[PDB]
Amino acid sequence: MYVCHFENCGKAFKKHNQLKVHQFSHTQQLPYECPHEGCDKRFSLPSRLKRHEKVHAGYPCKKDDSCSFVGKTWTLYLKHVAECH
Amino acid sequence: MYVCHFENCGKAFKKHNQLKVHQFSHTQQLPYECPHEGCDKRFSLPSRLKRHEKVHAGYPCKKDDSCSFVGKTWTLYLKHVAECH
Numbered sequence: 767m768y769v770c771h772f773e774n775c776g777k778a779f780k781k782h783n784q785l786k787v788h789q790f791s792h793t794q795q796l797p798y799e800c801p802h803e804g805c806d807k808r809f810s811l812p813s814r815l816k817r818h819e820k821v822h823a824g825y826p827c828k829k830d831d832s833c834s835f836v837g838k839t840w841t842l843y844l845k846h847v848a849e850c851h
Numbered sequence: 852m853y854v855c856h857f858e859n860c861g862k863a864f865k866k867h868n869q870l871k872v873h874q875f876s877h878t879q880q881l882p883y884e885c886p887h888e889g890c891d892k893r894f895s896l897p898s899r900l901k902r903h904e905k906v907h908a909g910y911p912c913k914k915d916d917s918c919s920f921v922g923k924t925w926t927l928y929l930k931h932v933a934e935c936h
């Protein structure tokens with residue numbers, strides 16, 4: 767089965783095209799797609815997309831796979847790495 | 852900055868605890884949490900959680916990291932692997 771990854775859904779469909787058509791119900795409401803290849807993040811406002819693209823530009827913590835820290839600068843990244851985990 | 856991973860959000864906070872408090876606004880609306888360790892999936896209905904747990908029990912496609920197929924049976928998994936990608 768093809769399973770919908772959108773939040774609070776998980777509806778499953780026998781055929782891939784049925785999932786794609788279903789998913790239009792989500793993407794219509796979230797027209798602003800992240801331009802990075804492989805990233806499935808979408809938003810309903812341009813400002814939220816822009817904020818998200820700035821996060822891509824930063825320095826994500828990979829010490830912990832649970833950690834949601836993304837440093838705006840290299841200084842703040844190395845400080846985080848030293849003080850956490 | 853600590854960045855919120857919930858859909859259509861991405862709000863960022865200087866401190867980890869500020870993100871956690873913010874995230875209560877999401878989790879209050881999605882009370883049904885997946886019991887699998889490492890899985891952040893949440894739902895607003897018990898039926899959606901149950902469906903999601905059944906997906907965990909199945910056979911996820913790992914030929915493609917984009918593919919959303921999860922086989923209900925081993926037969927259907929190997930058929931998918933042969934006919935796709």
Ligand SMILES: [Zn+2]
Nearest residue numbers: 770772775777
């Ligand atoms: Zn869906």
Ligand SMILES: [Zn+2]
Nearest residue numbers: 800802805807
């Ligand atoms: Zn992105």
Ligand SMILES: [Zn+2]
Nearest residue numbers: 827833835850
């Ligand atoms: Zn971290």
Ligand SMILES: [Zn+2]
Nearest residue numbers: 855857860862
């Ligand atoms: Zn949020």
Ligand SMILES: [Zn+2]
Nearest residue numbers: 885887890892
């Ligand atoms: Zn799960």
Ligand SMILES: [Zn+2]
Nearest residue numbers: 912918920935
């Ligand atoms: Zn596949």
